Design a protein around this ligand. Structure first.
Ligand SMILES: CC(=O)N[C@@H]1[C@@H](O)[C@@H](O)[C@@H](CO)O[C@@H]1O
Ligand SMILES: CC(=O)N[C@@H]1[C@@H](O)[C@@H](O)[C@@H](CO)O[C@@H]1O
Ligand SMILES: CC(=O)N[C@@H]1[C@@H](O)[C@@H](O)[C@@H](CO)O[C@@H]1O
Length: 145
């Protein structure tokens, strides 16, 4: 129930969400990407604000998941980045399909987190984006540490 530290795992590929470059201290607007590796710089915390909306926090840096530019309605294929700012456009909802695999939905726009290109096997360092489509390659699993 979303307390503690988690790996965010892409169902189709098994890859994880990382800051690009994997650093403990990425600057603002660093891209989020998928990558196979596991380490403490790919852990996240979920901060429950109530009523099923969450801030997604990078453990190592304390920065949050944003759409690049922070719009209420980002276009399809808008990059997800880390940023220290907080506001309504960096909130997310987790929708369970019913077996513990989730769509990760941007509250403001209703778009979902996808690997860019939607592959079942994104290459390492593929950017994560927002997109309106739903399919099995935009499901994620939250793996507690
Ligand atoms: C050696 C090392 O930490 N490598 C990291 C890797 O684990 C992953 O975090 C990646 C994400 O872009 O960034 C680097 O290549
Ligand atoms: C929209 C705005 O006024 N500021 C935001 C900032 O808060 C953050 O969301 C960032 C993410 O790239 O995009 C803009 O710079
Ligand atoms: C046709 C096809 O592959 N569509 C996908 C789409 O569903 C979405 O996953 C997107 C994310 O960048 O990548 C592709 O455009």
């Amino acid at each position: 129930h979303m307390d503690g530290y988690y790996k965010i795992k892409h169902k189709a590929s098994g890859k994880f969400v990382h800051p690009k470059g994997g650093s403990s201290n990425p600057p603002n607007d660093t891209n989020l990407v998928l990558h196979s590796d596991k380490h403490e710089r790919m852990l996240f915390q979920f901060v429950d604000l109530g009523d099923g909306y969450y801030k997604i926090k990078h453990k190592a840096s304390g920065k949050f998941v944003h759409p690049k530019g922070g719009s209420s309605n980002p276009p399809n294929d808008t990059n997800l980045v880390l940023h220290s700012d907080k506001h309504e456009r960096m909130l997310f909802q987790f929708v369970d399909l019913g077996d513990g695999y989730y769509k990760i939905k941007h509250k403001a726009s209703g778009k979902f987190v996808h690997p860019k290109g939607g592959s079942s096997n994104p290459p390492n360092d593929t950017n994560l984006v927002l997109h309106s489509d739903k399919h099995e390659r935009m499901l994620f699993q939250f793996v507690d540490l």
